[PDB]
Amino acid sequence: PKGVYEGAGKEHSCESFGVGLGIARIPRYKGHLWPRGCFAPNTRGGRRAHPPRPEKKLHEEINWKEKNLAIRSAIAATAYKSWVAARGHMVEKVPSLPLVVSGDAEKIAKAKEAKKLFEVLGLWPDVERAAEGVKIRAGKGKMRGRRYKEPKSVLVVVSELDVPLIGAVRNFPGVDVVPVSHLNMLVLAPGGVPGRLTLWTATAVERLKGLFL
Amino acid sequence: MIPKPVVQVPRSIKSGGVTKWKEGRGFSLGELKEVGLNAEQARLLGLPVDTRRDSVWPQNVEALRKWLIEVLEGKATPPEPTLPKVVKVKRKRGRAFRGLTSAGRRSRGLISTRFRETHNYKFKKKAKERRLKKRHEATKGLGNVLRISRIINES
Amino acid sequence: PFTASAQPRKQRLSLYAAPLHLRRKLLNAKLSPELQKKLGVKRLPVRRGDTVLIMRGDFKGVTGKVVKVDLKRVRIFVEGATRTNSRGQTVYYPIHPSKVMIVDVDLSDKARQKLIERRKR
Amino acid sequence: ARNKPLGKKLRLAAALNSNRNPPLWVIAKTKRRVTRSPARRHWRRQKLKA
Amino acid sequence: RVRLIRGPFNRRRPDSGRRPKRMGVYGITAWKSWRQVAEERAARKFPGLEVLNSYWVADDGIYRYFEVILIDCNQPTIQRDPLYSGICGREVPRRRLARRLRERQRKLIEHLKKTLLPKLKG
Amino acid sequence: MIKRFVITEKALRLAERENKITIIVERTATKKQIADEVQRLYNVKVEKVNTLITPRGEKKAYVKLAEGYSAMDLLTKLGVL
RNA sequence: UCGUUGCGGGUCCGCUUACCCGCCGCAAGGCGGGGACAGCGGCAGGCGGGCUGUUCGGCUGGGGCGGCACA
RNA sequence: GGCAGGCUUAGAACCCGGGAUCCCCGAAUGGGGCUUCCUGCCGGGGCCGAAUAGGCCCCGGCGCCCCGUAAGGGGCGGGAACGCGGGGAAAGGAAACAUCUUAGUACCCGCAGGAAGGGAAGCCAACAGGGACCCCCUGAGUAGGGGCGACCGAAAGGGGGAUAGCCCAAACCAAAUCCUCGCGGGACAACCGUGGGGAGAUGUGGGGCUUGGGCCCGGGCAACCGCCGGCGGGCGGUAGCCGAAGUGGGCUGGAAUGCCCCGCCGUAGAGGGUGAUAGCCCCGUAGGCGAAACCGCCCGUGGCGGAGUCCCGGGGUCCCGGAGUACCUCGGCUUAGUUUUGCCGGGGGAACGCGCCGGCCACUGGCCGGCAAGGCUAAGCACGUCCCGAGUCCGAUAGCGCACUAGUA
Ligand SMILES: [Mg+2]
Ligand SMILES: [Mg+2]
Ligand SMILES: [Mg+2]
Ligand SMILES: [Mg+2]
Ligand SMILES: [Mg+2]
Ligand SMILES: [Mg+2]
Ligand SMILES: [Mg+2]
Ligand SMILES: [Mg+2]
Ligand SMILES: [Mg+2]
Ligand SMILES: [Mg+2]
Ligand SMILES: [Mg+2]
Ligand SMILES: [Mg+2]
Ligand SMILES: [Mg+2]
Ligand SMILES: [Mg+2]
Ligand SMILES: [Mg+2]
Ligand SMILES: [Mg+2]
Ligand SMILES: [Mg+2]
Ligand SMILES: [Mg+2]
Ligand SMILES: [Mg+2]
Ligand SMILES: [Mg+2]
Ligand SMILES: [Mg+2]
Ligand SMILES: [Mg+2]
Ligand SMILES: [Mg+2]
Ligand SMILES: [Mg+2]
Ligand SMILES: [Mg+2]
Ligand SMILES: [Mg+2]
Ligand SMILES: [Mg+2]
């Protein structure tokens, strides 16, 4: 939630001085600054007419059943090269989609070894697209800690939390990794667009059969 | 897993005979007596004890017997006793000035009726709702807007 | 102790408002490969009397002794990285320590040797 | 006034001590950023409420 | 012993604009009883003492008489009294009660092993 | 209690012509305390003390030494001249 | 009118100790007068622009007076 | 960001902990105070002086109301908001306006804490059962109040956060009691021994707390209840330390972090700085380590006191169980409380466990539920001067009035 200070521009000692003085009847400073305008939104230092309010509803709620239908729809899109390529991923070197790797991959602990795994599955070019695609974004976001805009590359889906592969891949540019039970629309359709280049482990695909349904 | 007492929800006239169960405040003295305990011993074992309750439910007795056997055989660890573990009484200053003596308690209504029904409680409760715009205080005149709208839309 | 916050405003406020004992950490410069095998450490705060090689800027490639360190400005003056003003005097270019490499270490100070043993470990 | 109480006189002394501009070396030290003092006043214009 | 004038409190007639409901004087009383007023006046005469309770003693045509009980919470005799400690404060370290309770629980389980476990399983 | 000496044109003239030293002391010092301090510190005899409070809030004492002690000699000995 | 309001005698008389008024006294208490009245609190009726809040309609060959062309 | 002169390797600056100094006014407290300054008495000290006189100066004590035998001790003033008690509007709304609302609000007076208040059934229910309290979600804008208009507005119940239960008085015993000081002992304590003083029969103390108790008899230790916070151990806070990998070739350029080519780390590609845009230059980050001193939390262990106060069974039918209170009436404020909410004031005014109170008008009978008028109580909930983090917030006429020698001139 965002907002202005509740008393902003409203705490000066001001009053309208009426008609007959040859000046507009907006409120003005009472003291030594007298004629200076005050309070009204059209005056310098005046209140903001319709500012943001912290009580504003920002969350767009969704039914649970509807959210889970969308998750299933987004999952299915990861199996189509047309949807994945249209989202912007590099899919030329990927042997097939959905990309399923053996559950042994979940034991890889070092970023160096996970890099080798990505290269031999044809996923490294998309990681390189994200590494080269990081830019300094235009506008005031730089001042607020949003200086860098980074493309998304690969979503790695593992069987469970705390497997070594989570730490081995999470440092790559644009890579997200989740256990299968943590799948969500933020990783499955960045930009609100279906088709994310996804690497499933075989054990993750098995666990998927009892989730989001 | 220390059992939780199961008690019956009071059956109102409004219900028309439909009944349900709920978690109780504590095990009754009758239930504890069937497993050979008093209120003190049961509290020392970490059990919630309700000496006010008169009913004895066999499902509560059965849960107590099962768990006691686990405890007395070293298979279950009782939690900490359900007795006070700290004593924290602060020095009081200006009891008379804040209406905390018996005379103040009487004038505040606390001798004749419940705290929730005293007038100062009503004043504070409604002030909070209006400050936060909670529940029915988000709309002033809500009842009359509903009443007139129902007439027009149900005519 | 330098903020943990990711907000640029708090990162910069930490840097500009840092007390003197924290500003010393900004004086760290990489040791030359030769010194790294002799001492076993990768970085040391630059000190007056050290000899540094300048790696960036107009005086890139110039090696000289550090003559003065300014904790407030986090700048160092190096022999050779100089110029003359209009009145003919010799003045020093203030060089940021992250742009130099230490090639000779001044170890006459016993207190400095403690820092080395800590980092060698 | 001719007949002053000391307490008032010492408040007048404080105002006399503070009524002056920053020294010239302060202007140099701050690269002309500090040139005025808020305590600077003229006896005829800005009145003390002493 | 506190003596005070009985009757309703000194309700003031408002001296500016009011709607008619807010203009009355006679019969309007305070939500405080005279007993609470007596306790408060006593407390002013004995600064630092705590009012424990009070009771009515007598009435006459103009006055009402109360007696107020006050205690000095700084006195060693007062501090350890089981009733007065509720006013003067009381602290028992958690390490004392918890240790005592843990010991009692441990000894009870051993006793119940002998005298109760067979009956439960029988 | 003595803060400094006054070595202005007026003060030096009073030293030579009237055997007086001029000092700045703490504002709460009295004529009795000023005379005691000067005698103890400098081993002279004080004839009388005249005091005033300057418009800048400082107490100034014109201290007249007795007729066996030289104000000019004392200032020279102290090295304040 | 209820309470303050008590004590003797046959609604009446008396009494003083309540209470009230004044004098003296630092206070303690004394003196004199009144006296279960008065005064004071609650309740009730009357007088009550002393003070508080308000209302002083509409149509209308401008408003007002009239009229009611206001049902 | 100046001119000088110094300090610092005998370890400074700086940061953290602990100390020292700390003018006058200020609760301000010897007394004043129309000038943040003046002035008194007593005791001690110094000086001027022939003086021991007299005068001047310095230092300390000297507030009001209280507790306590005294020694001694307490209250006072402040704090951004939050909390408790009391006093208490109008504007506006009702398309006028008075009941009403606004609102028990604004504001005023008093009083607390790190939270406050509440809290342990004279309860709720309906013959089925819940089981202290507060706070959150709901019941619900329902019942109900109301020029039955505007509008106002519960509670029980259900789901959660959290969980905890006790004491004073009295019955019975009758000084077995508490406090203070000296001396000896006792982890610097509690406490023990002894002596003096104070409190105490108008009752200290024991006992007792709905699973009522007192009283009588028997049996049993897993008795029960309380005081001290020493010693050992651990963890945390208040400074910090360690932490991977290019400053590689060429180009442009004042200067590269940019472009081309070639490498490397990654549990670290959060973010910042650096002569233009940096994972690998530096700070940092993932991750790990750390305290002479001060503070906090937890655990183990130690010291001691009581009148058996603890558990179980039997007997009881005797004793105790809270007053201007319950209740009636009149006026008034308030409440959804309505012939029925709470309270204040005036007048009247109980009973006692074989009794008393409640079950939406009163009374009667039945049934059901309880024991007012004494006290305490952790946790779970409010707030933001302050500290930390975050951000579809603003970007110097914006955003706090103040990005700056702003609550300043
Ligand atoms: Mg503004
Ligand atoms: Mg929207
Ligand atoms: Mg732009
Ligand atoms: Mg409402
Ligand atoms: Mg003038
Ligand atoms: Mg009005
Ligand atoms: Mg003079
Ligand atoms: Mg009369
Ligand atoms: Mg009358
Ligand atoms: Mg009028
Ligand atoms: Mg009319
Ligand atoms: Mg008209
Ligand atoms: Mg007419
Ligand atoms: Mg004073
Ligand atoms: Mg206070
Ligand atoms: Mg308004
Ligand atoms: Mg109106
Ligand atoms: Mg009007
Ligand atoms: Mg609390
Ligand atoms: Mg409390
Ligand atoms: Mg209301
Ligand atoms: Mg007793
Ligand atoms: Mg480091
Ligand atoms: Mg590094
Ligand atoms: Mg009772
Ligand atoms: Mg501005
Ligand atoms: Mg601009």
Approach to solving: cryo-EM
CA torsion sign for B103, B107, B112, B115 is negative
The amino acid that residue A66 corresponds to is E
Determine contact, residues E34/E54, Cβ cutoff 8 Å: no
**Is E10 within 7 A of strand G by CB distance?**
no
Q: Which two tokens stand for residue A23?
A: 């000046």
Q: Which two tokens stand for residue B39?
A: 């209120």
Phi, psi of B89 (to 5 degrees): -115, 120
The rounded distance, in Å, linking the Cα atoms of D10 and F8 is 23
Please state the separation of Cα A42 from the chain's center in Å. Answer: 36
Resolution (angstroms) stands at 2.0
The answer, yes or no, to whether the previous bond of A27 is cis (omega within 30 of 0) is no
What kind and span of H or E run contains A199?
A: strand A198-201
The rounded distance, in Å, linking the Cα atoms of B46 and F49 is 88
Residue E60: which nucleotide is closest by CA–C1'? Answer: G4
Nearest to A141 by CA among A133, A129, A128, A150: A150
H-type helices in E50-93, by residue range? 76-79, 85-88
In angstroms, what CA-CA distances link A92 with A72, A75, A155, B93? 25, 20, 17, 80
Nearest to A207 by CA among A41, A27, A25, A75: A75
Residue A112: which nucleotide is closest by CA–C1'? Answer: H266
> What is the Å distance from ligand 17's center to B148 Cα?
22
At which residue do the structure tokens 């469970």 appear? A160
Q: How does strand F2-5 pair with strand F20-25? A: antiparallel
Q: Which residues of chain E from 61 to 120 reach within 8 Å of chain B, CB to CB? A: 73, 85-92, 94, 97-98, 101-102, 104-105, 108-109, 112-113, 116-117, 119-120
Residues in chain D: 50
The rounded distance, in Å, linking the Cα atoms of A175 and C52 is 41
**Is E106 within 7 A of strand H by CB distance?**
no
Determine contact, residues C62/C49, Cβ cutoff 8 Å: no
In angstroms, what CA-CA distances link B63 with A21, B59, C75, C118? 88, 6, 76, 62
> What is the Å distance from ligand 24's center to E69 Cα?
74
> What is the Å distance from ligand 3's center to A140 Cα?
8
H-type helices in C7-120, by residue range? 8-16, 20-23, 33-39, 110-120
| Residue numbers in A near C7 (CB within 8 A) | 144-145
| Residues B71, E91: C-beta atoms closer than 8 Å | no
Whether C6 contacts chain A with CB within 8 A: yes
Nearest to C29 by CA among C18, C17, C43: C43
The rounded distance, in Å, linking the Cα atoms of A62 and B147 is 31
Residue B113: which nucleotide is closest by CA–C1'? Answer: H342
Phi, psi of A110 (to 5 degrees): -105, 140
Determine contact, residues F1/F26, Cβ cutoff 8 Å: yes
Q: What is the DSSP letter of B104?
A: H
DSSP3 helix / strand / coil % (chain F, rounded to 5): 35, 30, 30
B154 annotated to a ligand binding site? no
Residues 6 or more apart whose Cβ sits within 8 Å of residue A49 = A41
CA torsion sign for C32, C33, C34, C36 is positive
